[model samples]
Target: PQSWEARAETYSLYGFTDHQRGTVVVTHGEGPYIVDVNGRRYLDANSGLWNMVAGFDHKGLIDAAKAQYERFPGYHAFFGRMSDQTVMLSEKLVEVSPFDSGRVFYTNSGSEANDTMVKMLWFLHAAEGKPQKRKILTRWNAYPYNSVFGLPLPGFVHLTCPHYWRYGEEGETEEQFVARLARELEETIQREGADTIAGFFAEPVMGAGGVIPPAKGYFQAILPILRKYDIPVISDEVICGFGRTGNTWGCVTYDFTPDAIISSKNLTAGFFPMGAVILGPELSKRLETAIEAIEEFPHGFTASGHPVGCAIALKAIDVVMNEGLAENVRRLAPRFEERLKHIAERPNIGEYRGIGFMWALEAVKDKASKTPFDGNLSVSERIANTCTDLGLICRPLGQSVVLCPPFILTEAQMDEMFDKLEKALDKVFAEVAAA
Candidate 1:
């Protein structure tokens, strides 16, 4: 008979191989860990696909959500509707947010949040009588949940991922490498022209792509280029918001004072799908006029700022702040970086890139040349699979293995997680070497 693994292979999205997530059914959990149906427990180092902040079954979050459900079953922030929870959530977002002069527009997920952003960009450009300016520039590997409108935007262009060892040129000075990229950006704008470029989308730190932070001076050089054409910049903080980058927001960490921001993922600790596209003064004013003129204004999802979701999010924001979760991440980041660097020194690691809690280990075939092992070899998946077997949950994207623990995780737990990860890595490398 075919097993649970076989059935799992059939049902899973992304079409997992017969061996991946097959018969290993996970049943339950407590803080930072979970138990499979078979009773074996595992540290949740991946944070439920990078969204479970308080970990599985957190009583506070659970009780809070339950309270909201009991109070108000649902809410629809449509047709200029109103709900106390939704209203307060908007206020709270703008109050704590890093935006200079911004207004929040809600959505149901990162993908939708990004989709809304394109509309805002086009609307703003049109208001400015620059209808031709509709392009969005971003880094090639950055993850902004590329939905239909989100990616392949004639409005959008992506720069390279800078892993230094992986993407940086041989003997290239840090300043030179960055300058070269900045030149490419300026060239792209020149080729496309200011009349057709609307804005740039940047992740303060690349997530899912490789968990690498922006290289030093990268943003400083890029921001002015955006302003030179009067194009707005959008920070897709779907993966970096709510203290994920050891800061309240990655904008603060990376010094990108963007015109707008896309926030999601941990906004409600992932209890529900909720996102916000916070607009700056200029864009917000245009959108306000556009709404008033049309009467219907064009967009918004039903689940956006849903009553239950907003209530949960409001509570989650308080919890994140009261717990001083960002500070906790600050204290742990250095240690996390130190350990990953130690691992990087090992011959198997090509590069280790991170900032704060987000970190990625780039695998390579030769330490000296730092050349990537062929992608067809699937080293990343093999390492990822082995890590899962060793009671840890880590994922490898391309040649990089990303590790971003929940902010609430303790130092000791981190030690254990990395130990398991190192062991899994060692095992996979040995297997590859032998083969």
Candidate 2:
């Protein structure tokens, strides 16, 4: 058989692998860790790019998927119809989601979910005969899905991300910092006119952008602005959802009343590719009218509401709720925060911030002055390498390293993960300090 490398070379790889490492192969999976073909097991602290919330080898997930697979090997949802499991999963979504979200539209990935939200927003406003309402506002460093094409779309404005590494030196208070951001958002609305700006997008807690939880009163300050413009906000909860933030939902954790929610990742506990844009009454009513005439929405996909995926996702929801994963996450969050705070106390560290399980350790070359290391240092990647050597797989992103382990992880395990990280930091700090 050809090696994984040979197969990837022929295929159009989605840029997920370690190509420079030359076929870094994952040969097996267990709780909180993956074993390479070379027989080394590393704790998956990043949880498979932040998806494996319940850890690997969740039997309930396995059983749910297997049952659905046996019942309907393959099927599609169409013509106002769907598999039994898919329909039930839809109901469960509204039950658990914080919004009074009555309608759900599905896709297979977070990017697709955001893509669908874009279409739905445009379509809903157009259906209401408000053709002029098309613009959207978003934060600058947010990861709402990247477009390779230049100057993305109209109404899409990316404002600033106010973490220390990027924007801490303006002698601005946290209040001033947030007001500055909200001002940019409000100014963008002014430039576009409140009438044309249909909505704004925000990651109640920033994810791939930097795990930068919003400043105190950040959402409270900006949400009113969006509402003043009658601009609905899409809480892109793709990362913070499913108890990642200790709360049952990110909305509760961050305190935002979103009109539409783009959710995925732990929605299925990493068992399947599934995402949904949950809609409120106003958007749903508009969608209903458009569907009446169009007969079928021209949008959607082949595996959109896949039954097996839905069943497994629904079961995953049960596991989260029944097992009290949210409470467990809440209990652990303080400890996680404490560990991060201690890391920040170290010499090379600048700031430590997180809410619930998601977190980052922003590093600096000069701790007192908070000056960044030279780009040539590549300190983040080096710490990530160190973590890997110590049998953990946390990600080193931007100027900081990130840690988001499985929610089901025990106190001992959680401590162990962070302990190994401190050891990794010990090695990292000594080398970089001398250099």
Which prediction has the highest lDDT against the true structure? Answer: 1
Could you tell me which 10 consecutive residues in candidate 2 have the lowest summed lDDT?
15-24
Judging by TM-score against the true structure, name the best candidate: 1
lDDT of 1 by residue, 1-435 (tens): 255555556787644644144346677778888888668788887787777877888788899999987776545434545777877888888888775565787788887798789877787567657788788787754323545432455656667765455567888988888888889888988988878887788888878567878778888888887788777788888988888787778898887788788888688887898878877777777777876774565654232467777888888888777776667789888999899889998888987888877888888898898777877778888888887788888877778888877778899999999999989888888888898
List candidate 1 segments past 4 Å from native.
1-16, 19-21, 74-81, 141-151, 292-296, 301-304
Clashing pairs in 2: 135-155, 136-155, 139-159, 140-159
lDDT of 2: 0.78
Model 1: lDDT of residue 333: 89
Error of 2 at 3 (Å): 6.9
TM-score per prediction, in order, is 0.92, 0.90
